[PDB]
Design a protein around this ligand. Structure first.
Ligand SMILES: *CCC(=O)N1CC(Oc2cc3c(-c4c[nH]nc4-c4cccc(OC)c4)ncnc3cc2OC)C1
Length: 310
């Protein structure tokens, strides 16, 4: 009974009010397009993305993708509204550089240390916000992050985002087709999903970005990981990874869920590094790479107040 009313605001739009241009995707569900939204009256043109049955209807996808949109996090992808033609249209803001997994594989050779550590602050900022709304994303990966600008990235493709009650901090799952590679040990065993289980996936997400779009547990069938992690083995140290940057990812994989760091601590740990990225990421040609300043003595553990949230 003692819960907060979900006062989210869904919006309905017309298929005549969109001027769809190119085809972004053709997935095994629907299709995403490079649209453009020109509203009635207003002298505006907004770049948008457009999605397009057997047993249940698709709406659960958009229900969570609007409840979190009440206060606004700038690093969490948002839904503008929907169109109700015979074949319904889901309409979001356009993030022109695609997913981040295709940005660390295509632009792999021009990724500065600054660009990397920053994307890791943004993902923990947007992932801290989802925790503040008691929601568990359950699919934090490089592929579920889009590029608004090379500097501004946002978390997308919720899919399994589960809301939690006032006196609730756990989740019971029924299996499915969830990627075991990114899954925390509890999720695999007695199928528990908490905010701390998303931290393990954050550890894999950043590990992916440090290996420049590499395959976690490459050449490995998804059935041994259950006991392979029980023995103690984990993903091995990336090359550009100083012991500072790497030990964060290791501490995100501590079996006792309380030992993993909270996303507010991850924002702090990485924000420090983003002030001097040279000392933490060893990239061959660091300063000569590109993609489209101090004032104190013991400026070491110094963090700005915008990134301090206890
Ligand atoms: C790594 C992910 C991937 O394979 N691709 C190609 C890249 O493209 C896009 C996609 C989008 C999207 C988007 C991606 N997947 N779903 C969406 C989306 C669109 C509308 C509504 C929802 O949620 C209900 C989700 N969103 C926005 N902009 C895109 C731009 C792309 O490349 C330019 C996705």
């Amino acid at each position: 009974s003692g819960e907060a009313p979900n006062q989210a605001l869904l919006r309905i739009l017309k298929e005549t009010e969109f001027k769809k241009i190119k085809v972004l995707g053709s997935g095994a569900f629907g299709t995403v397009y490079k649209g453009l939204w020109i509203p009635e009256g207003e002298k505006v043109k907004i770049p948008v993305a457009i999605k397009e049955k057997a047993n249940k209807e698709i709406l659960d996808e958009a229900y969570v993708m609007a409840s979190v949109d009440n206060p606004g996090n700038p690093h969490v992808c948002r839904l503008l509204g929907i169109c109700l033609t015979s074949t319904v249209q889901l309409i979001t803001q356009l993030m022109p550089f695609g997913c981040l997994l295709d940005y660390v594989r295509e632009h792999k050779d021009n990724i500065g240390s600054q660009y990397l550590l920053n994307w890791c602050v943004q993902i923990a900022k947007g992932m801290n916000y989802l925790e503040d709304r008691r929601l568990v994303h359950r699919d934090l990966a490089a592929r579920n992050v889009l590029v608004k600008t090379p500097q501004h990235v946002k978390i997308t493709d919720f899919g399994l985002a589960k809301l939690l009650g006032a006196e609730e901090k756990e989740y019971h799952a029924e299996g499915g087709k969830v990627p075991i590679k990114w899954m925390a040990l509890e999720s695999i065993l007695h199928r528990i999903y908490t905010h701390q289980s998303d931290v393990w996936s954050y550890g894999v997400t950043v590990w992916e970005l440090m290996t420049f779009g590499s395959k976690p547990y490459d050449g490995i069938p998804a059935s041994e990981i259950s006991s392979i992690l029980e023995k103690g083995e984990r993903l091995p140290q990336p090359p550009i990874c100083t012991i500072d940057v790497y030990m964060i990812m290791v501490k995100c994989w501590m079996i006792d869920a309380d030992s993993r760091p909270k996303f507010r601590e991850l924002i702090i740990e990485f924000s420090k590094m983003a002030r001097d990225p040279q000392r933490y990421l060893v990239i061959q040609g660091d300063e000569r790479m590109h993609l489209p300043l101090m004032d104190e003595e013991d400026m070491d553990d110094v963090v700005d107040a915008d990134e301090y949230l206890i």
